[PDB]
Structure formats: structure tokens, C-alpha cells
Design a protein around this motif. Structure first.
Motif, PDB file in Angstrom:
ATOM      1  N   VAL A 189       0.751  -1.459   0.058  1.00 27.89           N
ATOM      2  CA  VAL A 189       0.006  -0.185  -0.068  1.00 27.89           C
ATOM      3  C   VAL A 189       0.763   1.387  -0.066  1.00 27.89           C
ATOM      4  N   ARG A 236       4.622  10.628  10.389  1.00 26.53           N
ATOM      5  CA  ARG A 236       4.573  11.046  11.896  1.00 26.53           C
ATOM      6  C   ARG A 236       3.794  10.079  12.803  1.00 26.53           C
ATOM      7  N   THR A 237       2.743   9.464  12.170  1.00 26.80           N
ATOM      8  CA  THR A 237       2.073   8.577  12.890  1.00 26.80           C
ATOM      9  C   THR A 237       2.904   7.170  13.315  1.00 26.80           C
ATOM     10  N   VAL A 248       1.966   4.139  12.497  1.00 23.43           N
ATOM     11  CA  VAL A 248       2.352   3.124  11.506  1.00 23.43           C
ATOM     12  C   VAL A 248       1.834   3.707  10.206  1.00 23.43           C
ATOM     13  N   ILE A 249       2.234   3.061   9.037  1.00 20.26           N
ATOM     14  CA  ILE A 249       1.693   3.584   7.912  1.00 20.26           C
ATOM     15  C   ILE A 249       0.804   2.359   7.053  1.00 20.26           C
ATOM     16  N   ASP A 250      -0.296   2.373   7.170  1.00 21.16           N
ATOM     17  CA  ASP A 250      -1.277   1.391   6.554  1.00 21.16           C
ATOM     18  C   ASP A 250      -2.558   1.738   6.344  1.00 21.16           C
ATOM     19  N   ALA A 251      -3.556   0.910   6.250  1.00 17.27           N
ATOM     20  CA  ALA A 251      -4.727   1.135   5.839  1.00 17.27           C
ATOM     21  C   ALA A 251      -6.004   1.735   6.675  1.00 17.27           C
ATOM     22  N   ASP A 252      -6.384   0.813   7.688  1.00 18.74           N
ATOM     23  CA  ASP A 252      -7.694   0.796   8.186  1.00 18.74           C
ATOM     24  C   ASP A 252      -8.128   2.345   8.913  1.00 18.74           C
ATOM     25  N   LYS A 253      -7.138   2.567   9.718  1.00 20.16           N
ATOM     26  CA  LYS A 253      -7.423   4.045  10.669  1.00 20.16           C
ATOM     27  C   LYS A 253      -7.521   5.135   9.747  1.00 20.16           C
ATOM     28  N   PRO A 254      -7.479   6.476  10.640  1.00 22.15           N
ATOM     29  CA  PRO A 254      -7.431   7.564  10.014  1.00 22.15           C
ATOM     30  C   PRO A 254      -6.491   7.793   8.865  1.00 22.15           C
ATOM     31  N   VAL A 255      -6.972   8.333   7.713  1.00 18.38           N
ATOM     32  CA  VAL A 255      -6.392   8.339   6.364  1.00 18.38           C
ATOM     33  C   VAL A 255      -4.967   8.957   6.453  1.00 18.38           C
ATOM     34  N   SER A 256      -4.548   9.020   5.154  1.00 20.13           N
ATOM     35  CA  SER A 256      -2.998   9.582   5.089  1.00 20.13           C
ATOM     36  C   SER A 256      -2.633  11.136   5.584  1.00 20.13           C
ATOM     37  N   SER A 257      -3.639  11.740   6.019  1.00 18.17           N
ATOM     38  CA  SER A 257      -3.488  12.902   7.010  1.00 18.17           C
ATOM     39  C   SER A 257      -2.625  12.377   7.960  1.00 18.17           C
ATOM     40  N   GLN A 258      -2.445  11.274   8.565  1.00 23.00           N
ATOM     41  CA  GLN A 258      -1.433  10.807   9.279  1.00 23.00           C
ATOM     42  C   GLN A 258      -0.096  10.482   8.768  1.00 23.00           C
ATOM     43  N   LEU A 259       0.559  11.661   8.500  1.00 20.72           N
ATOM     44  CA  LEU A 259       1.853  11.554   7.430  1.00 20.72           C
ATOM     45  C   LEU A 259       2.785  12.672   8.079  1.00 20.72           C
TER      46      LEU A 259
END
Lengths: 242, 152, 152
Positions: free
Chosen positions: C3, C84-85, C87-98
């Protein structure tokens, strides 16, 4: 959906525990009393995160997530939370942040009061190093006590005109400034000794404590030089009169 | 905005939890009309080069919005597409200038402190080392430590 | 992981390009074993933040490499979409976690100086308008001036 919600709740608890422990109230945060308060607040936040994780509702959510196959989510929530680490930090700060030596050093404008406050900060740091509190934290407390003593001595000299006083009054104000600087230095020495002892007792984690010291030696030198200049001016006036 | 729309579809599905494709809340973010307006502004408008997207799941209800401005929250992430280049033409993808990225999805205090400590300062430090920057790094570290002390 | 590589192809390899979707150079760069390993490291570890995928054109072949490391190569039009989050994956809050960062194909020193002058200082300006931030702004201005003087 319930398993996803439980995994999300575990991850949110881990993130909240990380936020609670993120505000590192180390010796670099404020004075010695301020660093002790920051360490106590960080320990309280870690304890709150651990309580939120170990409460019955959070335990039921974790069990539901585990039954829903969210083992990775549960592991991530447990690793990011650090409730046990926060509780250990709070317990260490229990024997380290209880006293108020830095406040005594700041309030003691006299050299004896500054030395007593620095000694109290150093003793609290040594007690913390004996307890679960770090030798580095004890050194930070001693350094904050010494810095508060130096700031109090500078404030007292500025208010009472230690530099701006005449022969006798300026000599007295400079003697007070030198005593305050010496008290800050003694408190820093005590804090450094306590940090070294805590590092020796905790060599697996703490190598040693900070030198603590203080931040005024220049003020004491200026006060001694001002007293000497008043004496030299008195001698010059006496020679002129003779 | 085809890359911008695909950024909110597939690139949005790659920074969160488990691994895979677009979740339901990401689809809800992409289905917002404000998301389409922000994508069109990022594709065309050079002055307005900021877009947002958010896929929340709070007790579970899925309540999040896609905007054209910087936003943040607790246990939730909202995007802030910062663009170094103003405009985007029609040839080949543009989701790197106004890239879909923001702060973290955790509580904003620790994330902002870590960002100011080692995300803007490190870029200046690496740039200066490859080619001032240490002063900006010291000021950013001081700001991050002050924010941490104020939060503590 | 996969992903993250898809996000890289959709977003990161889009800097010098204009508008569209993922190119073949993006797929060739992100399909590398080192690219997959770096994508997985950004996906799981929180310390491994930056992920760069480039659509390069060197003397004008469409060939580049995607990796966690960000460097100025031969027309390396990468984009360090840092994380910055946790992890970097799918299920949780979107790639605004970067984390948000853009890079150009040419030497990125002047690009970083302009970014600091026009969006990093503007970020502190927006924060002040909402409200050691002035120290950050003054030091960023000094860093930009020093970078301009050193490059000139």
C-alpha cells in the motif's frame, strides 16, 4: 465492526498514553522544582493511561478485539501506551519531587538561605537517586536549585543596589552577591554528588548525574572588586589627606 | 486533480493501521463535495494550493470532513497539502507538490513537538550539509522544548 | 508495504510532472526489493518516516529508484512523504497521518530555502494569526538568507 472498533480503541489508548508520557518533565524543563513538577505530571499522565487501559471497560474492549483477531492492534496499543513505564516514572518521582529546595534557594536572597535551598535541592535529588528517580533528574534538581539561588542573589543585588551602592553599602551588597553565588555553587556540588551516587547505584541506566552547578560567580567577583575599589578609594583619600 | 483524487483514494489508504485498500471513511472523505472543490483548486488554482481529507472512526461513527485548509485533532488526522510549486498542468501526475500529508494522527502536542524538533530543522541541516540552518535548528528545538514544557 | 508503494507511485513520483496518474518509472522504482523494504519500514516503524519515489529523466529516460533515503540525484523528482504516525497502513484515519515534504528534480537547496521563506515561515505566521514562534520565524529568515548567500 466490533473487532475493528476494539482495535481502534486500543490504538487510541496507546496514542493517548504516548501523549501523556510525551511531555518529558526532565531537568531541562524549568528549574529544579519545575522539573520535579514536570516529572510528577508525566508520571500522573502515565498512571492515567495505565488506568484507562486496565479499567473494566478498556479490558472488555481489549478482549473483544482479541476475540475479533486484533492481536496486532492489541500489541500496538500495549506497546504505545506504556502505563507500567508511566507508573514507574511516577513512583520514582515520589521520592524525588517531594521537596522544594529550588524554591528555598530562590527565596533565600542571603548567602546562607541560598546555600540552604541548594542543599535541600541536592538532598531531594540524592533521595530521588536512591529511589527510582534518576541521578540525571537529581542533578537537574540540584542545578535548578543553584540557578534559582543565583537568580535570587542577582535580584537581591539589583533591588538593594549591590553594584550601585557606595563604599560600605556596595561592599555589603557585593558580599551578599558573593554569598549567593557560593550558595548556588554549593547546592550545585551537592546536586552533582547526588547525581553521581544515583548513577553509581543505577549504572545499568544512569551513567552519572549532571554537574548541576549554578548560573553568579561573575557577580561575586564584581562585588569583591567593588569592595576592594572602595578600600582603595578610601586609601587614596587618606593619602591625599595626609 | 486525477493524482489529487487518487491521493485521497489509494495514497490515503496507506498511512493508517493494518494494510490494504481504501476504507469506508476514506471513501466518505473522497465523496465529499468539498474534497472535489479542494482537488480542483489544487489542480488549477496557484494561490489556493491547500487541500484536506480525513477518515475518522470515533465511538463506531465515521465522522470526518475534507477541507481546503490545515486542521488537526485528538486521535484523528486532517490533511494539510502544503505545495512548494503553485500550479499543476495536465500531462503527468501531480500529487507531490500539494501532496496529501499533514501532522500525525495522535494527540497534537507530542506530534507538533517532534515535528518542530526533527522535521523542519533536519531539512535545513541536511540542505546546509549538502551545500543559518543551525540557528534555525536551535530555534526550532527551543520552540519544541518550550511547547513540551508548556504542555507539561 | 505494498500500500505504501502504491501511495508512492500515486503521489511521490509527481513533482516535476504536471497532472495525471502513476507512471511506469514510479512502478519500476517502487517495485524494488529495497523499495518494498523501505515501504514496509515506513509502514511499521515510526522512526522510519521519509519515503521517496522519483520519476526521473536523465540525459530523458524514465528510470529512477524509490527508497526511504531522500537525495538529490540526476533529475531525482522524488517526494519525501515522511511518516509521523506510529504506522503507515490502511484501516485507521487516512494519510493525513503522515508528514509533508516536497522535493524537485534539480538541486533542492534553493527549493528548500524558498519553501522555508514561503510556507514554513508562513506556517508560523498562520499560527501566530490564530493565536518561541517569532524566534522560529526570525531564524528561518536568517537560514533562508544564509542559504541564498551560500548558493550565490
Amino acid at each position: 465492526t466490533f473487532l475493528n472498533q476494539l482495535q481502534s480503541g486500543v490504538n487510541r489508548w496507546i496514542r493517548e498514553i504516548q501523549k501523556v508520557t510525551k511531555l518529558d518533565r526532565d531537568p531541562a524543563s524549568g528549574t529544579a522544582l519545575q522539573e520535579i513538577s514536570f516529572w510528577l505530571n508525566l508520571e500522573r499522565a502515565l498512571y492515567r493511561i495505565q488506568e484507562k487501559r486496565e479499567s473494566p471497560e478498556v479490558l472488555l474492549t481489549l478482549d473483544i478485539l482479541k476475540h475479533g483477531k486484533r492481536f496486532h492492534a492489541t500489541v500496538s496499543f500495549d506497546t504505545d501506551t506504556g502505563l507500567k513505564q508511566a507508573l514507574e516514572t511516577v513512583n520514582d518521582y515520589n521520592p524525588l519531587m517531594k521537596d522544594f529546595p529550588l524554591n528555598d534557594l530562590l527565596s533565600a536572597t542571603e548567602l546562607d538561605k541560598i546555600r540552604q535551598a541548594l542543599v535541600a535541592i541536592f538532598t531531594h535529588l540524592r533521595k530521588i537517586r536512591n529511589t527510582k528517580y534518576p541521578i540525571q533528574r537529581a542533578l537537574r534538581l540540584v542545578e535548578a536549585i543553584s540557578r534559582d539561588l543565583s537568580s535570587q542573589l542577582l535580584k537581591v543585588l539589583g533591588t538593594r543596589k549591590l553594584m550601585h551602592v557606595a563604599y560600605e553599602e556596595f561592599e555589603k551588597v557585593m558580599v551578599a552577591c558573593f554569598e549567593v553565588f557560593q550558595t548556588w555553587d554549593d547546592e550545585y556540588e551537592k546536586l552533582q554528588v547526588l547525581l553521581r551516587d544515583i548513577v553509581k547505584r543505577k549504572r545499568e541506566e544512569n551513567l552519572k548525574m549532571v554537574w548541576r552547578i549554578n548560573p553568579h560567580r561573575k557577580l561575586q567577583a564584581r562585588l569583591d572588586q567593588m569592595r576592594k575599589f572602595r578600600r582603595q578609594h578610601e586609601q587614596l583619600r587618606a593619602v591625599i589627606v595626609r | 486533480v486525477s493524482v489529487l483524487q487518487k491521493h485521497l483514494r489509494k495514497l490515503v489508504p496507506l498511512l493508517l493501521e493494518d494494510g490494504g485498500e481504501a476504507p469506508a471513511a476514506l471513501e466518505a472523505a473522497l465523496e465529499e463535495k468539498s474534497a472535489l472543490e479542494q482537488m480542483r483548486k489544487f489542480l488549477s488554482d496557484p494561490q489556493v494550493h491547500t487541500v484536506l481529507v480525513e477518515r475518522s472512526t470515533l465511538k463506531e461513527f465515521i465522522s470526518y470532513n475534507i477541507n481546503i485548509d490545515i486542521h488537526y485533532g485528538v486521535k484523528s488526522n486532517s490533511l494539510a497539502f502544503i505545495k512548494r510549486t503553485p500550479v499543476i498542468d495536465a500531462d503527468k501526475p501531480v500529487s507531490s507538490q500539494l501532496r496529501v500529508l499533514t501532522l500525525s494522527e495522535d494527540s497534537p502536542y507530542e506530534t507538533l513537538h517532534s515535528f518542530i524538533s526533527n522535521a523542519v530543522a533536519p531539512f535545513f541541516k541536511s540542505y546546509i550539509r549538502e551545500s543559518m540552518a543551525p540557528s534555525v535548528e536551535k530555534k526550532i528545538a527551543e520552540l519544541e522544548m518550550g511547547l513540551l514544557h508548556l504542555q507539561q
